[PDB]
Amino acid sequence: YKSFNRTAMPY
Amino acid sequence: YKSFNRTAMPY
Amino acid sequence: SAVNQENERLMEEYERLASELLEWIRRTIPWLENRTPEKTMQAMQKKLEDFRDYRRKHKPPKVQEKCQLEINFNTLQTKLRISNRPAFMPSEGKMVSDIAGAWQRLEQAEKGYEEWLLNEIRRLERLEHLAEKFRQKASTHETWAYGKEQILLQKDYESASLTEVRALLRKHEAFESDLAAHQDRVEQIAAIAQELNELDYHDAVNVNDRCQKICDQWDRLGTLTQKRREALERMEKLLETIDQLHLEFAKRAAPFNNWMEGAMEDLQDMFIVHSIEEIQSLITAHEQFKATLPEADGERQSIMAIQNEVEKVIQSYNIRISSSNPYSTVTMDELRTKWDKVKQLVPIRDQSLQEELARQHANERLRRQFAAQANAIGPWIQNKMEEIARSSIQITGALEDQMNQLKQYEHNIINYKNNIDKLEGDHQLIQEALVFDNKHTNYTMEHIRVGWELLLTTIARTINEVETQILTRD
Amino acid sequence: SAVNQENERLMEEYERLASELLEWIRRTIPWLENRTPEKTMQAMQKKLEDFRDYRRKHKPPKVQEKCQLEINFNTLQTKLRISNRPAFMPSEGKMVSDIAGAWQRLEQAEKGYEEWLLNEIRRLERLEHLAEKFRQKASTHETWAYGKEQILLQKDYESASLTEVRALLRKHEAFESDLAAHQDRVEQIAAIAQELNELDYHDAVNVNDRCQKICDQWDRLGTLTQKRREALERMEKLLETIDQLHLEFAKRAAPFNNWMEGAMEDLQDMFIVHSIEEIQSLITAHEQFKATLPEADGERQSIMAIQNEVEKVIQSYNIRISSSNPYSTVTMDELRTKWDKVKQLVPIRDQSLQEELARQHANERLRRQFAAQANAIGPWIQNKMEEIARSSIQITGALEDQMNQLKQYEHNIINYKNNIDKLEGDHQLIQEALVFDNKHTNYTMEHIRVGWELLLTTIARTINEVETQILTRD
Structure with a gap:
């Protein structure tokens, strides 16, 4: 199963 | 006697 | 049993x-x-x-x-x-x-x-989580683009200036970066609708449509953003090339308006010359100016060819705005009517210069004819006085022989009276023309006047003296 | 007589x-x-x-x-x-x-x-010519300066933009060249009034005044032209330094607004992880972002220090105009309230990440206690089956000695029934928590279920087989 979960982009 | 008479300035 | x-x-x-x-x-x-x-x-x-x-x-x-x-x-x-x-x-x-x-x-x-x-x-x-993540992502991006298409359609820039168009372009530049950040948002939603298609969601009928509507709008935004940039970059390059012409217009308009406004005073400037060289030097300087008239007319045509270029720009590119120069207060009518007034004054200055040349020539003509008579009458009287001075002393003791010569000199003087009257006329004419500076002769009318007045006083004197000497001798 | x-x-x-x-x-x-x-x-x-x-x-x-x-x-x-x-x-x-x-x-x-x-x-x-040349020159220059002083006083630029002020400066530049061309005009009129003073004109009383009035106005024009240039160059350098701040503002406003608007989606983004490493990797990436918060807060303060500088410029130089940015659609309120929403979402994401960490830990706790029993019950049943298989064939011909061991194994199984019931509870709890991936053990409840179901079926089988063999032997 693929992962669609996203993480906030650090500055 | 002085001369006050003027002449047009050529371009 | x-x-x-x-x-x-x-x-x-x-x-x-x-x-x-x-x-x-x-x-x-x-x-x-x-x-x-x-x-x-x-x-x-x-x-x-x-x-x-x-x-x-x-x-x-x-x-x-x-x-x-x-x-x-x-x-x-x-x-x-x-x-x-x-x-x-x-x-x-x-x-x-x-x-x-x-x-x-x-x-x-x-x-x-x-x-x-x-x-x-x-x-x-997986279907239950992906269903709520799709609804979450497709609503946050649905709402983002509410009105985005209509704002992209706005034709406000059609009446904007180079300041407002560059400012508009910088605002549009920022929206392009805002758009780029949502490419990974629609990429994600397309993959969530594909995973919900593979896993067979009961309502994948409405997800296939709700996702294709969002992906179709995205295609519209891509092109619309480049079409408004194409219009803003065109408007920026049209007003940019109009400003290059409005600055170059004002650059040569003031030097020419200053030359034209200055030449109008000099074409009317009054003068008074008493020498034939004094008037000649003015004609020398005026004919020098007459030579820089095709030189400045060529500049005048060049300056007008620059304001005719800005009317050609608005016409060819059909961007109807004010073709007026906001840099120079020098109008095309000013350059047409002011030039006509300068060309109108040249024959006036030529006419008034030549009429004074005619005056100086006539004044010198009178100086020359006065000197011809003065340098002939003056020395004739000085030689007639010396003849009488020599004839009034000693000679033959006979008074009658000196009385013959005295009455002979008298006749010589009577015959010369008309020649003196000539000078009185030409003298009157010289002062009537307002001339007093004669370089050709040393004698004035007064110097001849006293010579003649002495000549008649001393002929009658020596005649009467010989007449008393003839009588007081018997 | x-x-x-x-x-x-x-x-x-x-x-x-x-x-x-x-x-x-x-x-x-x-x-x-x-x-x-x-x-x-x-x-x-x-x-x-x-x-x-x-x-x-x-x-x-x-x-x-x-x-x-x-x-x-x-x-x-x-x-x-x-x-x-x-x-x-x-x-x-x-x-x-x-x-x-x-x-x-x-x-x-x-x-x-x-x-x-x-x-x-x-x-x-000379007096008659100089009198008319003075009247000619003093009227053409009198009329030139009609209104020149009042126009120089105009304070229109107080509400003008950098475009209108530069354009105004280029118009003022042209008037300076127009002024320069008339220095030799007033120089001439001053000398005509001096020659009419030396030659004693009958009305030199009014010429001394009419010339000093014109020469006094000239002194006013010299200073006034430099005072309006001083105001135009100041207004140009105030709006020039305001534009440098409005461009630098918009330059860093969009990248920050895109980062802030992007981080709001990522702070709420739903997820589902079934590994203790799967959740850990999210915390790894979230705590990386938590480290770039003073890094971007410092940038936020720097960007606001630029729009506070433009309000300071209008206040210090008292040139009251609109301190609004015509380049960026990002307001100071947007940067205050959007930041507060991003800081408000960080404890929400920390709370929701840790609650899922607690879940993954509890799920692994259940996996570990199930495997401890399965990898003990499974091999106990496989060894109890092999004991019965060896005890059901040959041995002492006496059935009663094998009937003792069979009823002994039976007791061993009765005492183990509770230990099986333990696994049924922990199995129910694993699937109740929605876990099915146990890496520590090879056996599932069904593999133990069939082993126990075989174990009771084959104890009663071999017990009944020994009971029929005891009776069919007298």
């Missing part, structure tokens, strides 16, 4: 106990061969507990009850063998060979019931 | 002719000693013809009439000497010695009458 009644109550036990588990086995077989999935995940969560209660509560007794009936058979058939009694045959199909086949088909029905529910709730679990 | 009457009519001739020219000499002497100049030049032009008619018409007869009376005297006194008659003595003062003194004073009166009129009309001629 005491034991004969014991076997009747034990053989009906196997017949009743076989129907007890066969009515259970026939009621659970259609349930075990269900495999029809439910819509919600919670329904399959309960359906797994329904199978769990069967596996830990209703199958454990029936497993023991299967071999328990076999235990009773493999003892009852040994009892009817010791006391050799007729063998037992079960009614209809409640036999050992028959019950084994019911459990063989029941255990064949559940050969994947646990594995079907597990991988149905495994699939269902 | 015939000749005695002839002398009486000749001596009264000299007495009458002396009064004829003495009444003329006494009437022209006050006229000759006039030397009082006239105002117009035309009046002195006539006064020169008045002297000319005297010199060529009225003096020539009187010159001859002077020596003619002397001729008559130097003959009449020789007649009264031949016939010795009493000498003639003229009445009152009509004598020869007396008349010579009248002509000596008359010729002494005109010792510069022609030279006075000439150099009075010589001066007058």
